[PDB]
Amino acid sequence: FNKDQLEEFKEAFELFDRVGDGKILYSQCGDVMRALGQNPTNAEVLKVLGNPKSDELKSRRVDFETFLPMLQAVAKYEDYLEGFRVFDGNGKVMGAELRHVLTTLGEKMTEEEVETVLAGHEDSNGCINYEAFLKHILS
């Protein structure tokens, strides 16, 4: 990363500082990476954090300089489509089935997280065009 990128990333990082000390929580690190365009799994985020214990995850604070190597480490389509085709062959996926799998398998998401992303993409039958849904969440 060059100076301009670092300035831009730092500005974004500073928006997440809810205490004014120029720092974020460990638990916010993942959110900042995602806000800067990365899509790390939670597992990947915990790995760059050094697999912290519950206690340090909730209270350890990092300045931008310490955050940066973590962002770097994380930073360094045909599969995505096939991934949705698992849950299909008319190019659709039930909204109910997708809701269930996203909240019960893998790195489970809350129903509210799932509701937010799924809002407006399912039709009257309760079906999501996933190729269309995929382009949207990748945009």
């Binding site: 928006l15 959110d31 995602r34 489970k108 997280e113 949207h136």
Partner: protein
């Protein structure tokens, strides 16, 4: 391999027997520990049992579990019982019935109707399903049926019998006369042992008789395996048969004044266990029940009083004390109260009885016998009178259950104990467990036959024989035979019998072992487990030579009609052997159906599953070894359509053919390389244990990967949206 990150296992636990744990890190060969999350490091090089995938859990038949082992069975029964309040589950052909200690509204007319006319498998497990299959096969095969209800008393055997019968009666006042006889049969056949307050010490077979149009016409009770030894001996904290305590607690009732009964601690034959009273049981109240039931089954009041006279006589008989006299002879003290009463009650001459209690015939001299021989003879007499009384009572219950209509067919409900294993096992337990070996052979042969037939049907090409255990027990030079032989030697003892057992069997038969620090015990590897027996008391419990002249004196009585009505060395063990052979002929001439009743807790708690108790019960009833045998073959059995449906997501579009069966075959052979792991039948794929679980793991892995990819993208998107919102100043 299978022990990967994510994979779940069962590990030992003091309270729950087994506890679940997930592989917190992937197992690599050479690892000495597993990284587990209940976090914890589990020190092994046998790996712990694998936990079944969720789709196989809580199913109606335990043999559909891919990892078919004890924790899977325990867990599956548990979740069905606790989470779904299902007391019935199949284990292949076996119906497992867990006592809910709660009246369940699952036996009503509406439910009987829903089972009637259905196949075995289309309905949820139920005692009705078994009763229907027995009714159905009766007519279809023109063949008598047996429903063998095994388990300990109080595990729910009487309910199962009740509703099998209620069912047959409906789909076709038999049920109520049979149940009315229960208090009779419990009074004369059940006893308090150390582990069970109301244990049946005999096998009861109620042949439900059907006419030519399969309507119930009546019933016939046959009895087997009565524990004769208990009549004259109880171990610590055990009682004699209930009826004796019912009678003694009723001692002050006017109509029994002539029986001259004391309390239960008065009589040698009822006092040995030091347990006159069972908590919660009013033996005087149960006597009332018994008499009412006797009246309900047509036994006149004179005959009832005769039954009680005879029992009272057994009790006074047991108090008869012998004095040792010159030259190893004996005599009965002058005017001996126990004998006078006995002779009064039976109506026999005092001197004629006292003479023959101390002498035998040898032809033709009149030889004195010793005190030990006189005691043995007196006991044998008590047992003989009891056994014949018991048979009389049964014969007369039968007069009330028999029908005039001729019988075309029957379904017999066998109420039988499972294996019995206490800390200290004696002759009683040995006999029970012997009975269980014989019953298990019939089951094993039955199942093996059903299996051949299934494999033939599906066009697919192992038998666990327990004949050696049976031979060790019952064949010449076996345990019982040696026991008989030792009993007829005048200097015989438990200790010399023990050594004869070691001399004959130790290192010659792998099923026989000797404890390292004892020469007074042996160990038999039975079907379900090793059992250690203590030799003490086996000889005396086995002795059963009744003296003919003592019987002739009783046969000559002129006070009441009941007593004469009752009437190589004879031994209890040999009589047990004969009774058991008789039971097996009766059962082997039928088609058996199997219900295993288990007590899930020791405190009569409604829907409460204690894992330690449940594991013990499942073992004692044969289930865990039956599962182990099933787990050795091809227990998992899926139709091609089930396999297609479930594992479509594992298939490339390329190999999804119109022939869905051929698709399964091509896909399976690429998913699981070793073709010995499954067999392609006509309608079904048969899999070894673990294979379905493995398919679920790759399927699960596929879904997990797809999901995480999607959900990390969603998480990205959500945060970019939030970020735009916070950037705009929201």
């Amino acid at each position: 391999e299978l022990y990967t990150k994510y994979a779940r296992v069962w590990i030992p636990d003091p309270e729950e027997v087994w506890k679940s744990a997930e592989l917190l890190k992937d197992y690599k060969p050479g690892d000495k520990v597993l990284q587990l999350r209940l976090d914890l490091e589990y020190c092994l090089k046998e790996l712990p049992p694998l936990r079944n995938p969720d789709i196989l859990v809580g199913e109606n038949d335990l043999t559909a579990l891919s990892y078919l082992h004890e924790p899977a069975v325990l867990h599956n029964l548990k979740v069905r019982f606790i989470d779904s309040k299902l007391i019935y589950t199949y284990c292949g052909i076996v119906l497992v019935a867990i006592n809910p200690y709660e009246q369940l509204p699952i036996y009503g007319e509406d439910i009987i109707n829903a089972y009637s006319g259905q196949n075995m498998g289309d309905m949820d497990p139920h005692i009705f399903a078994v009763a229907e299959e027995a009714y159905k096969q009766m007519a279809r095969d023109e063949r008598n049926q047996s429903i063998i209800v095994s388990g300990e008393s109080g595990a729910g055997k009487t309910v199962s019998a009740k509703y099998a019968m209620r069912y047959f009666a409906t789909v076709s006042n038999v049920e109520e006369k049979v149940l009315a006889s229960n208090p009779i049969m419990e009074s004369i056949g059940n006893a308090k042992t150390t582990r069970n307050d109301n244990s049946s010490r005999f096998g009861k077979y109620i042949e439900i008789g059907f006419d030519k149009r399969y309507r119930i016409i009546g019933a016939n009770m046959r009895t087997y395996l009565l524990e004769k030894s208990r009549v004259v001996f109880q171990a610590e904290e055990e009682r004699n048969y209930h009826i004796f305590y019912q009678l003694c607690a009723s001692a002050a009732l006017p109509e029994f004044k002539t029986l001259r009964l004391g309390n239960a601690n008065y009589f040698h034959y009822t006092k040995q266990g030091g347990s006159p009273v069972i908590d919660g049981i009013d033996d005087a109240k149960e006597m009332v029940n018994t008499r009412q039931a006797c009246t309900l089954l047509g036994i006149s009041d004179s005959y009832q009083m005769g039954i009680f006279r005879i029992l009272a006589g057994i009790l006074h008989l047991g108090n008869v004390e012998f004095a040792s006299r010159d030259s190893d002879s004996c005599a009965i003290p002058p005017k001996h109260d126990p004998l006078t009463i006995f002779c009064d009650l039976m109506g026999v001459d005092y001197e004629e009885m006292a003479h023959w209690l101390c002498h035998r015939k040898l032809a033709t001299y009149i030889k004195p016998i010793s005190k030990l021989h006189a005691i043995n003879a007196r006991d044998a007499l008590a047992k003989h009178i009891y056994a014949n009384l018991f048979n009389w009572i049964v014969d007369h219950v039968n007069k009330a259950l028999h029908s005039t209509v001729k019988q075309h067919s029957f379904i017999g409900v066998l109420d039988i104990y499972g294996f019995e294993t206490f800390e200290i096992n004696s002759f009683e337990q040995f006999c029970i467990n012997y009975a269980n070996e014989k019953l298990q052979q019939q089951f094993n042969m039955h199942v093996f036959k059903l299996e051949q037939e299934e494999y033939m049907k599906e066009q697919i090409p192992d038998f666990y024989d327990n004949q050696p255990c049976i031979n060790l027990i019952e064949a010449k030079m076996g345990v019982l035979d040696l026991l008989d032989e030792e009993c007829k030697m005048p200097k015989g003892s438990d200790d010399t019998w023990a050594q004869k057992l070691y001399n004959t069997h130790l290192n010659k038969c792998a099923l026989f072992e000797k404890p390292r620090l004892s020469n007074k015990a042996f160990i038999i590897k039975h079907f379900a487990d090793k059992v250690e027996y203590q030799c003490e008391g086996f000889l005396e419990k086995n002795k059963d030579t009744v003296y003919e002249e003592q019987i002739k004196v009783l046969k000559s009585s002129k006070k009441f009609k009941l007593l004469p009505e009752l009437f190589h060395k004879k031994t209890v063990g040999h009589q047990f052997r004969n009774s058991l052979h008789l039971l097996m002929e009766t059962l082997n001439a039928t088609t058996p159906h199997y219900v295993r009743c288990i007590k899930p807790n020791d405190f009569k708690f409604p829907f409460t599953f204690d894992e330690k108790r449940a594991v013990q019960q499942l073992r004692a009833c044969g289930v865990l070894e039956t599962i182990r045998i099933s787990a050795a073959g091809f227990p998992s059995r899926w139709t091609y359509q089930e396999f297609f449906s479930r594992y479509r997501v594992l298939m490339k579009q390329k190999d999804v053919l119109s022939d869905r069966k051929q698709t399964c075959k091509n896909v399976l052979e690429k998913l699981i390389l070793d073709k010995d792991k499954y067999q392609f039948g006509k309608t079904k794929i048969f899999f070894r244990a673990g294979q379905v679980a493995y398919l679920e793991k790759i399927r699960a892995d596929k879904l997990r990967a797809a999901c995480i990819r999607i959900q990390k993208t969603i998480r990205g998107w959500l945060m970019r949206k939030k970020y735009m919102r916070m950037r705009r100043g929201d």
